[PDB]
Amino acid sequence: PSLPERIDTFTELFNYQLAEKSYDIRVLQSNYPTKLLSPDSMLPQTADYPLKDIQQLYQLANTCRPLSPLITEPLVFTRAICKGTQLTPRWFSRSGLIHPGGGSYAARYVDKYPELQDKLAQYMHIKERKNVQGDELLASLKSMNDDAINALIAGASMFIEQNELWLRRGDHYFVFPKSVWQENVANAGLSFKLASQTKSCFVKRGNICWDVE
Numbered sequence: 001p002s003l004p005e006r007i008d009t010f011t012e013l014f015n016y017q018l019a020e021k022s023y024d025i026r027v028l029q030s031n032y033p034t035k036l037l038s039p040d041s042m043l044p045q046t047a048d049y050p051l052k053d054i055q056q057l058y059q060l061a062n063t064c065r066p067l068s069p070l071i072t073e074p075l076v077f078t079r080a081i082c083k084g085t086q087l088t089p090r091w092f093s094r095s096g097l098i099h100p101g102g103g104s105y106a107a108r109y110v111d112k113y114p115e116l117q118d119k120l121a122q123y124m125h126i127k128e129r130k131n132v133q134g135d136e137l138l139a140s141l142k143s144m145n146d147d148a149i150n151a152l153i154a155g156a157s158m159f160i161e162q163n164e165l166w167l168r169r170g171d172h173y174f175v176f177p178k179s180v181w182q183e184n185v186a187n188a189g190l191s192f193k194l195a196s197q198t199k200s201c202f203v204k205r206g207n208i209c210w211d212v213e
Helices: 003-012 025-031 051-063 069-083 089-093 105-112 114-123 136-142 146-153 178-187
Strands: 021-024 158-161 164-169 172-176 190-194 203-205 208-212
Touching: 003 178, 003 190, 003 203, 003 208, 021 025, 021 136, 051 069, 069 105, 089 105, 089 114, 105 114, 146 158, 158 208, 164 178, 178 190
Parallel strands: none
Antiparallel strands: 021 172, 158 164, 164 172, 190 208, 203 208
């Protein structure tokens, strides 16, 4: 019984009608563009532009007083802020979402116009958003460390989120507590460490490095 065979056995020992939570990946995809989930989005994107471009961008942002086509959309946004031009939710929805300095256009816009928070929150990076009562998915996403959220972005078959197992079945993730998954690990004859806990990760699924028990 190979390791990938034991992993298949492991996934078949769960009762998916008994998961504590489940999320439709297609609904997740509709509500959360990848750019609003990726940890990299919150870091400066400025390396993806020739210096002469960003030179135009911060001169414009800092003084409100450029040629490259690649900088068109950041220019439109910067000019809009400088001038008081209204940017609608549809504008944000059709934009690249992420500002060259890191973070979202929408979070910067709401900084200038705080009353727009609720209308524009869906165009902000999850790391910029506040949790909302009853929005369990947004809470689940915000609490994921980088390895976990990156496994989810990749559509990984499984990953560990703190002490809970997220298990993909079809187009859904089903979430199980340690009481359930640690038994199924043992019953499949497996053991694992997280990718952040070991250097040797020969059989990897999401952030899980599998081995025999």
